[PDB]
Amino acid sequence: AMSGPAAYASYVVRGANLVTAVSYGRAMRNFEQFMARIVDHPNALPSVE
Amino acid sequence: IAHGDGRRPNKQRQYIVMKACNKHHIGAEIELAAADIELLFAEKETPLD
Numbered sequence: 001a002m003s004g005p006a007a008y009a010s011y012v013v014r015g016a017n018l019v020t021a022v023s024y025g026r027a028m029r030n031f032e033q034f035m036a037r038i039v040d041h042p043n044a045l046p047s048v049e
Numbered sequence: 050i051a052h053g054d055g056r057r058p059n060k061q062r063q064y065i066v067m068k069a070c071n072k073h074h075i076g077a078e079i080e081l082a083a084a085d086i087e088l089l090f091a092e093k094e095t096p097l098d
């Protein structure tokens with residue numbers, strides 16, 4: 001008797017994802033989490049925790 | 050004008066002047082896309098669509 005996910009995981013191109021998708025024709029995944037390592041914490045080392 | 054020399058004086062006169070309209074057609078052009086006529090009716094999808 002295992003355990004696991006009951007549903008899928010979503011992916012919408014709402015917000016600023018849409019901008020580079022429509023204009024530049026290339027898109028992202030998790031644009032905000034992508035952004036927070038550049039505009040907020042740009043010096044952050046690659047650490048697992 | 051009645052004038053009193055030895056002409057033949059002339060009687061009353063009358064004219065028939067016929068006028069008609071003139072027809073003009075004018076022809077223009079619109080082309081529309083394949084996909085535009087297709088996706089005019091979709092709905093409900095992602096905020097990209």
